[PDB]
């Protein structure tokens, strides 16, 4: 009911009913989903030396019969300077493309959907023409090179005699074009496929015909088609089956309940989280990670306290708790005048040494935190860190000068013990020592020895992966977690969408929402073609603000009343129209 109005138009930009543009060519590439197939990208080749060895057409040819193998032609072209510059013009471009392709697929995955299986077609050329895999050919490499240039010009998906249109053409076939050129390189043909010249000529004619056929048909109801294609695997597998993994788990709702949660643009996800990455020494040391985690972990004093007590002791220098007597020796000079002013009601707190250690927190920071929060009125003193018992001693002070029973004391004679309980109620529930805001008691400390992350480039050129620490967190405060020191502000991400929008802005939602949908579908194991998912997310963000696909989402769209009545609200919308 949301997508239905979206279709390919005859200029090929996919638009909805009110004619607004959804995409500029269908699914970002002009290609229909019926005739695309999985293919490998040779060019993501690991070591720089192996790539250079494999792809570069040799000129430092062996003085022996060299080259009369594979080709009978090179006796003709071993002397041409121009042919050497032109192939070098080809390889430097390949090496430049190679650099661009690494930026495109940071994951170092070489499996992409494309039309027209070039290995199987090339394999089909060898089969038909009956080409001996171990003989010299009559093929000319410049013919291949120029033929590939000529074939790229031939493969136009939308007209472009205009510089903007010319650029739109160049990028919209970039991935196929590097794939074409890297597979159909002069050395590839020569060292491997051994194709003859007419065989190459047929091969161009075949790639040309199947590619042109592949393009999407204007008129296709791709909006209707995409909605069912996503809809269908949602019917399949897992209502709410659990998958044991690492420490984590009661994490990220899986499947249809996650599809409903995601697609409704829920303000209150059932399990919101952020995957936080670490930097410097903190990305490889457990104890450093412990320190950053401690700053992040939203701990409240109630979590920390072993015990509380309230005591009636007007004068410390005669303490009811005889063991406390030494702090009085310790704290006689602590504002010695207002011991005549402090209330005879005493609060005592006992702290656990193991739990206090885990937060790596000090007693002075707590005294200073509570003193600063409540104010100078809340008079706090504390113990020696090396004592076997950890204690915090609390009294309550006033403003001295103004309290002389002027009228009747604007407090209405509230009991002071009772007020001390309210201090204890609030002091525990409010005080956010080291940990700031709601990420809750729940943290996870994960080693990514697991999946496909923390990988980079190296001097070898290969995608050697790192194994590093990360922090999964049940929480929402994405904004603050980014602001903290040593947290990687690049890769840190969330499964939540409302928060991603507030912090990162509408384009980031388009990416994250596609990723989250991609993630539920991969779990359930079934694969869905990328075009369909791109179209759904693009349909939802187009208005600018997220359009949940519910009556409070899509039925606010400026589409016509007669469409909107057939959705859900019916009578009310017709009345409002």
């Amino acid at each position: 009911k949301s997508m239905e109005s979206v279709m390919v138009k005859y200029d090929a930009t996919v638009r909805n009913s009110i004619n607004q543009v959804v995409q500029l060519r269908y699914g970002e590439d002009g290609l229909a989903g019926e005739s695309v197939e999985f293919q490998n990208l040779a060019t993501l080749k690991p070591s720089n030396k192996a790539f250079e060895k494999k792809f570069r057409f040799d000129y430092t040819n062996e003085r022996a019969l060299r080259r009369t193998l594979q080709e009978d032609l090179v006796k003709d072209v071993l002397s041409n300077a121009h042919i050497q510059n032109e192939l070098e013009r080809e390889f430097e471009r390949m090496r430049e493309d190679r650099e661009v392709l690494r930026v495109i697929f940071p994951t170092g995955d070489s499996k992409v959907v494309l039309p027209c299986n070039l290995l199987r077609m090339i394999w089909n050329a060898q089969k038909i023409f009956h080409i001996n895999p171990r003989l010299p050919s009559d093929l000319h490499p410049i013919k291949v090179v120029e033929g590939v240039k000529e074939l790229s010009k031939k493969l136009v998906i939308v007209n472009g005699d205009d510089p903007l249109s010319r650029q739109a053409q160049e990028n919209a076939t970039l991935l196929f074009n590097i794939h074409l050129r890297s597979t159909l390189c002069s050395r590839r043909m020569a060292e491997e496929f051994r194709l003859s010249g007419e065989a190459f000529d047929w091969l161009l004619g075949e790639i040309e015909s199947k590619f042109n056929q592949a393009i999407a048909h204007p008129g296709e109801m791709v909006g209707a088609l995409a909605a069912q294609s996503l809809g269908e695997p949602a019917t399949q597998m897992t209502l709410n089956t659990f998958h044991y993994a690492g420490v984590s788990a009661k994490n990220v709702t899986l499947g249809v309940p996650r599809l409903k949660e995601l697609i409704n643009i829920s303000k209150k996800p059932k399990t919101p989280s952020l995957t936080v990455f670490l930097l410097g020494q903190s990305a490889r040391d457990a104890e450093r990670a412990k320190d950053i985690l401690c700053r992040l972990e939203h701990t409240t004093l109630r979590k920390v306290t072993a015990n509380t007590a309230i005591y009636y002791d007007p004068n410390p220098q005669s303490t009811v708790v005889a063991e406390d007597q030494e702090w009085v020796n310790v704290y006689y000079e602590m504002p010695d005048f207002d011991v005549a002013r402090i209330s005879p009601w005493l609060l005592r707190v006992e702290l656990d040494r193991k739990h206090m250690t885990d937060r790596k927190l000090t007693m002075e920071q707590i005294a200073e935190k509570i003193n600063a929060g409540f104010g100078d009125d809340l008079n706090c003193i504390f113990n020696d860190d090396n004592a076997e018992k950890l204690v915090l001693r609390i009294r309550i002070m006033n403003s001295d000068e103004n309290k002389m029973q002027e009228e009747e004391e604007v407090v209405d004679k509230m009991d002071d013990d009772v007020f001390l309980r309210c201090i204890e109620s609030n002091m525990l529930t409010d005080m956010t020592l080291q940990g700031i805001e709601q990420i809750s008691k729940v943290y996870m400390h994960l080693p990514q020895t697991d999946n496909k992350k923390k990988i980079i480039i190296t001097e070898d050129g290969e995608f050697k992966a790192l194994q590093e620490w990360i922090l999964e967190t049940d929480g929402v405060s994405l904004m603050r977690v980014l602001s903290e020191k040593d947290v990687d502000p690049v890769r840190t991400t969330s499964n939540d969408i409302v928060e991603i929008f507030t912090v990162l802005g509408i384009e980031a939602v388009r990416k994250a929402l596609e990723r989250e949908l991609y993630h539920v579908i991969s779990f359930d194991g079934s694969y869905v073609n990328y075009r369909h998912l791109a179209l759904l997310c693009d349909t939802m963000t187009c208005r600018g603000h997220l359009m949940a696909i519910t009556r409070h989402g899509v039925n606010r769209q400026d589409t016509g009343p007669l469409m909107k009545c057939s959705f859900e609200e019916t009578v009310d919308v017709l009345m409002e129209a």
């Binding site: 015990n307 009636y312 076997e388």
Partner: protein, 125 residues
Amino acid sequence: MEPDGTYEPGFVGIRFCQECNNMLYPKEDKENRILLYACRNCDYQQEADNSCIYVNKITHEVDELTQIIADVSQDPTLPRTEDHPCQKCGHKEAVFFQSHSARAEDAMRLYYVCTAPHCGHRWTE
């Protein structure tokens, strides 16, 4: 002094009023360093003993050998054990079981109850 000294200062709720039998609340005498407990509806007041009026979170109540009433041993569906020697009487036949609570929180520790009339004695392991 020593940290071995148990923590039971006297929680104490009731010692309510002696006249109308309602609840007593602390209240101050700034003149004599004395706590008093007063009924809110009458003029009766009396000094308190301990200066303690409230504590919270012993956190470790071990409730391991308390509330667990000895008559539990008659239960036929609990596992009798040949594991011998009650620690009081020279007879085996301890009945045993986990936790039996929601406040236990994660205990796997066994509790043993001797079942012959000579004890009723209970003990953890």
